[PDB]
Design a protein around this nucleic acid. Structure first.
Lengths: 56, 234
RNA sequence: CCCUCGA
DNA sequence: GGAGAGTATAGGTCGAGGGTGTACCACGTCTAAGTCGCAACTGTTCC
DNA sequence: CGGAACAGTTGCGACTTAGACGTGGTTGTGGGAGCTGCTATACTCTCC
């Protein structure tokens, strides 16, 4: 155990696995808005992160 | 290399024998570097006095019941292991306990030899009827931490000598937690909480100070390899 | 709206 | 009167990134851009 | 911290224009794509 230094009590399965970085990434996901652009039609906020929209 | 923000130590006293300490803020990750070492140091590194073996007149081969005593053998052992004692002798010292007639036998009835102190005299030990008497010998020593019974077995051990588990450690229980404190933009800083409960021999304060002393020496062994070596100073 | 994809 | 058939309705939520123009000529009708003058209109400059 | 006198600017208002732009006429043939690979249910119409 890296934190306590104590050995873990039982043998754990370890090895090498092939892992991929998928194209879903927080940087493209995290979005937040206080106020912003509104649709001229329905006068509701826009939607999508690209348009700085609000959540439905 | 750099100089961090100086962490502070604080104490909230829960009871006379119990206290909480907080060290904060710590550079992220240092809470766990201090935590388990401080807990195990508090537990195993502080010297204290404890009962090691006992002799009970009237019990030899089978240890079950003592005639004229309500408590059985192993319950007397339990009541004795809870006895709080300090010793200056650094060598094993035998104390004696004898009481007759009806009444209650407490730790206050022990006659301490010079250089030992029973801190919990009112502790109930046994209870006797009119026909029974309790004559029991105790061998008290100094040590660190908690040694089991089998390690107290003498190779030349006397007949009727009962070895017991010894609690030398003046601190009874220690737990630790690492929370997150916020320093400017960093919310992941480390805060160390130590919940420590001791006997009435020591206060939590002096226990923490002792563990800190012996730790400073211990890692001083590494510091002394090179005194020119540069490290975090804050 | 549609295409394609995430839970 | 009464039965089949023909027509009507419904069918999950929230997110991310993308997304378009074959085809008559030979002309008059109008317009889409102007440069250019007086009023009308802004500004200083006083006494 | 007024009321004329006097001298710089937009700015509306005409008109010529040159080209986009819509109009005349319009006379041998010559009739679209796309699809239909959804299920299940209630109920009026409509053929009988």
């Amino acid at each position: 155990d890296g934190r306590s230094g104590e050995p873990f009590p039982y043998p754990v399965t370890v090895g090498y696995m092939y892992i991929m970085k998928l194209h879903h990434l927080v940087d493209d996901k995290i979005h937040a808005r206080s106020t912003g652009p509104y649709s001229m039609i329905t006068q509701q906020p826009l939607g999508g992160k690209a348009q700085f929209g609000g959540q439905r | 290399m750099l100089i961090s923000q100086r962490p502070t130590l604080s104490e909230d006293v829960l009871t006379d024998n119990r206290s909480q300490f907080v060290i904060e803020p710590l550079e992220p990750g240092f809470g766990y570097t201090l935590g388990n070492s401080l807990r195990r140091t508090l537990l195993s590194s502080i010297p204290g006095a404890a009962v090691t073996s006992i002799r009970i007149d009237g019990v030899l081969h089978e240890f079950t019941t003592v005639p004229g005593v309500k408590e059985d053998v192993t319950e007397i052992i339990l009541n004795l292991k809870s006895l709080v004692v300090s010793s200056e002798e650094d060598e094993p010292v035998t104390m004696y306990l004898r009481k007759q007639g009806p009444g209650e036998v407490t730790a206050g009835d022990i006659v301490p030899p010079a250089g030992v102190t029973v801190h919990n005299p009112g502790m109930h030990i046994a209870t006797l009827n009119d026909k029974g008497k309790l004559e029991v010998e105790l061998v008290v020593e100094r040590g660190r931490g908690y040694v089991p019974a089998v390690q107290n077995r003498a190779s030349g051990a006397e007949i009727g000598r009962i070895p017991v588990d010894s609690i030398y450690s003046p601190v009874l229980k220690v737990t630790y937690k690492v929370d997150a404190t916020r320093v400017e933009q960093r919310t992941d800083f480390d805060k160390l909480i130590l919940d420590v409960e001791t006997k009435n021999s020591i206060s939590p304060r002096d226990a923490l100070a002792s563990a800190g002393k012996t730790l400073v020496e211990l890692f001083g062994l590494a510091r002394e390899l090179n005194v020119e070596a540069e490290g975090i100073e804050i």
